[PDB]
Structure 1
Amino acid sequence: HSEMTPREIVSELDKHIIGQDNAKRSVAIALRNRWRRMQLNEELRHEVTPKNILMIGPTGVGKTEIARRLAKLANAPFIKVEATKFTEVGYVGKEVDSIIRDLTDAAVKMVRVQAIEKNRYRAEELAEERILDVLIPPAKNNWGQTEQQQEPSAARQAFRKKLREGQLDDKEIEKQKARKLKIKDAMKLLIEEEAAKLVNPEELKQDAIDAVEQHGIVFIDEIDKICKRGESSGPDVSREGVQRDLLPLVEGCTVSTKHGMVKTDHILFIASGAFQIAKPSDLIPELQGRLPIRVELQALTTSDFERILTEPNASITVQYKALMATEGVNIEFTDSGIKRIAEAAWQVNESTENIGARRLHTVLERLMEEISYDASDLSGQNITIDADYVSKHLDALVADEDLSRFIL
């Protein structure tokens, strides 16, 4: 769909993800390839398949984020499944086809909500005419000067102008309606009333299929958790099973959905792993083949942490400022304040368990717990979160490890 060059894709991705440039280019080549395909002939369009990617890296460093923004950047249906979610099907459990179903039920919850945007003006334009007709019951067979029904547009224009907020005046209009009612109702009762007429069925739902088949993006988290490990055997065939079960989906097949027959042949798959226990070559042959692209993501550094705090669009720090504004409070982060927030986050991750950038949300959130509460009773103030503030609120917590496993 999008005509963005890889380089432009990576750029656009740099607005939400710090670092991890390689994974960015990998995911960017993939998207651009979908464009590259449509520019080919009949034969070669069937033959050319998605270049599925296998992202390799430690927790919370941007794997899913990259895949989510990539998806969002191409207004593509996106689904994220955890691979072990099927390791129990040997006893019972969701079938893998569910992936394509969900990638469909959300590929719908998408075309639906996005059919409310396109149809949010129609009910308030060529449909607000409902009340205006009961405000000034049109002439007995309008004449015909294509400006005659635009003429009032004096008596008329006055009713539409006064309808800029003034209502609650009960009337009635038209299974059409007829029923007598208000306007904080007849008007809204009109919103949906005239909107279901513009949107049809066998195209809306027929399109979700079109999307999924053409722009679907499946993200299989922890694919490494379904590889074989030298600890047992019974659980391995269980794992290797999910691999075989996943095989049809990435090799090309047909799945049944209560919306129609979906074809996976062109769904893009981004698998994800840590590969500390297993290695990508432990994946079954058929799967390694369908996972041509391999890209690693590095662990995050304190500097990456500082940058993640403020650089992205709608960064946690930015959001925070916004939210405190809601309370009429002006929050401000000095460079050293942020340098310390990141510092703390790094400390806890190093002293206890490493959870990557996630740690910033809990640290940031604890740090602010006080302002968040008092925010309403501080209205009209300029609060500055500087290094001092940061230290007074986090030091004790970070310093105390056992407490860190609970509170941070």
Structure 2
Amino acid sequence: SEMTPREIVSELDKHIIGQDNAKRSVAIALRNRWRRMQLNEELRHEVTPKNILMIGPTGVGKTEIARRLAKLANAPFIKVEATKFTEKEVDSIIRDLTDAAVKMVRVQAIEKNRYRAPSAARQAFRKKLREIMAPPGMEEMTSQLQSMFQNLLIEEEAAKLVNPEELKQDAIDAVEQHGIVFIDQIDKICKRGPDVSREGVQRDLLPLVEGCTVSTKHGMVKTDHILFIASGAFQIAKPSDLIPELQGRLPIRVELQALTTSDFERILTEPNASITVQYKALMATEGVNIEFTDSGIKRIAEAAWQVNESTENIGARRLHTVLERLMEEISYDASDLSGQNITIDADYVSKHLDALVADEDLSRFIL
């Protein structure tokens, strides 16, 4: 895509609220992709992706930026927990990214084949018509062996139209050129002064960012120009605790601000397909019409902020648990309330929540 950095941020504002510095940082990395293609043969090999390190408390949108970014560029995407490797091989990151790129380009290939998939009597009828047991590591291998053994109209036409050798070669080029990976909670593999096992994971991840080659059943993939987005609260450790070889491979740094009560009020409504809009369409399925007052949206955001300050701050994720606890009575009766217009006023919010928010011992369970 040829979108300029401001055009990228403007699209991210349709989903993510605030955190513009993180939006500006990801826009720079995605714009350098298009900038690299316009360069000559020599510079395209020397220039490498400007990988980003997001820093901030949980639930502030570090992942949603990476998700919407890859969804914006139609790029292959995967999220991985860095701690998973403290105990799987690191090369699986590129494998799973390709398997997602395969299904992505494949279902997209069906889209091109879908729409392809007269006598007066011809139009008349046309109008009326309208076992192999293996350990877990090789379970995917025995799958392919079983599919090889089995080998030895929408389905037959789409198979006739599709080019399987093209879809497999394309997904590699979609990964080598446009791929994106998100390494969540990278701060937890930094040295606490386990430090050998923690820093050992950093060394195992190093070739993926330094440019290496990973074999896959779909083909041979190179990790040279893949973009990476690490994230971590970095409250315990600091980015300087990362190994020097890794710090130099994350040229862009950014800190995401903690969300405020006003941000919660915006997140509930402004973003496209916001959670409040979702239940409004859900209750519309039952014939019920729900409407949230601005005071009702205010106290909901006020309720989530209190739980985060009372016990544990989980970020905007607290909005999900609170909203479902508020609408639980409506969602159950929504079948019997068909044809009725329900209003979520400030009194309705205080009725279903203030008794719960007041008891911190209960808030740790119900919310």
TM-score category of the 2 structures, normalised to the smaller one:
over 0.9
Residues 98 and 188 of structure 1, relative CA distance in 2, 3 Å threshold = closer
Looking at CA atoms only, which structure, 1 or 2, has the larger radius of gyration?
Answer: 1
Give runs of ≥4 in structure 1 deviating > 4 Å. 175-182, 184-189
State the Cα deviation string for residues 59-88 of structure 1 (Å, max 9, x = none).
Answer: 000100000000100000000000011111
- Helix, strand or coil: the match of 1:219? strand
Structure 1 unmatched ranges of 5 or more: 89-93, 123-151, 166-174
Take 1:208 and 1:328, find their aligned partners in 2: how far apart are those partners?
A: 43
Residues 207 and 403 of structure 1, relative CA distance in 2, 3 Å threshold = same
State the Cα deviation string for residues 89-126 of structure 1 (Å, max 9, x = none).
Answer: xxxxx11000000111111121122222222222xxxx
- After TM superposition, give the deviation of residue 219 of structure 1 in Å: 0.3
- Helix, strand or coil: the match of 2:220? strand
Take 1:6 and 1:180, find their aligned partners in 2: how far apart are those partners?
A: 43
Take 1:179 and 1:282, find their aligned partners in 2: how far apart are those partners?
A: 42
Residues 333 and 179 of structure 1, relative CA distance in 2, 3 Å threshold = closer
Take 1:224 and 1:24, find their aligned partners in 2: how far apart are those partners?
A: 21
> Which of 332, 343, 355 is 2:291 aligned to?
332
Residues 41 and 391 of structure 1, relative CA distance in 2, 3 Å threshold = same
- After TM superposition, give the deviation of residue 185 of structure 1 in Å: 28
- After TM superposition, give the deviation of residue 189 of structure 1 in Å: 23
- After TM superposition, give the deviation of residue 153 of structure 1 in Å: 3.3
Residues 241 and 386 of structure 1, relative CA distance in 2, 3 Å threshold = same
Residues 251 and 386 of structure 1, relative CA distance in 2, 3 Å threshold = same
1:372 corresponds to: 331
Take 2:143 and 2:256, find their aligned partners in 1: how far apart are those partners?
A: 62
Take 1:60 and 1:189, find their aligned partners in 2: how far apart are those partners?
A: 50
State the Cα deviation string for residues 287-342 of structure 1 (Å, max 9, x = none).
Answer: 00000000000000000000000000000000110100000110000000000000
Structure 2 unmatched ranges of 5 or more: 132-138
- Helix, strand or coil: the match of 1:354? coil
Take 1:179 and 1:270, find their aligned partners in 2: how far apart are those partners?
A: 32
- After TM superposition, give the deviation of residue 204 of structure 1 in Å: 0.5
Residues 189 and 264 of structure 1, relative CA distance in 2, 3 Å threshold = closer
Residues 253 and 398 of structure 1, relative CA distance in 2, 3 Å threshold = same
Question: Is the 8 Å Cα contact of residues 303 and 322 (structure 2) preserved in structure 1?
Answer: yes
Take 1:178 and 1:223, find their aligned partners in 2: how far apart are those partners?
A: 33
Question: Is the 8 Å Cα contact of residues 49 and 226 (structure 2) preserved in structure 1?
Answer: yes
2:140 corresponds to: 176
2:160 corresponds to: 197
Matched pairs, number: 359
State the Cα deviation string for residues 169-204 of structure 1 (Å, max 9, x = none).
Answer: xxxxxx99999999x999999121211100011110
Identity of aligned residues (%): 96
Tell me the TM-score normalized by structure 1: 0.84
Please identify, of 190-199 and 74-83, the stretch whose mean Cα deviation from structure 2 is larger.
190-199
State the Cα deviation string for residues 328-361 of structure 1 (Å, max 9, x = none).
Answer: 1100000000000000000001101000000000
1:29 corresponds to: 28
- Helix, strand or coil: the match of 2:78? strand
Take 1:109 and 1:155, find their aligned partners in 2: how far apart are those partners?
A: 41
Question: Is the 8 Å Cα contact of residues 110 and 162 (structure 2) preserved in structure 1?
Answer: no
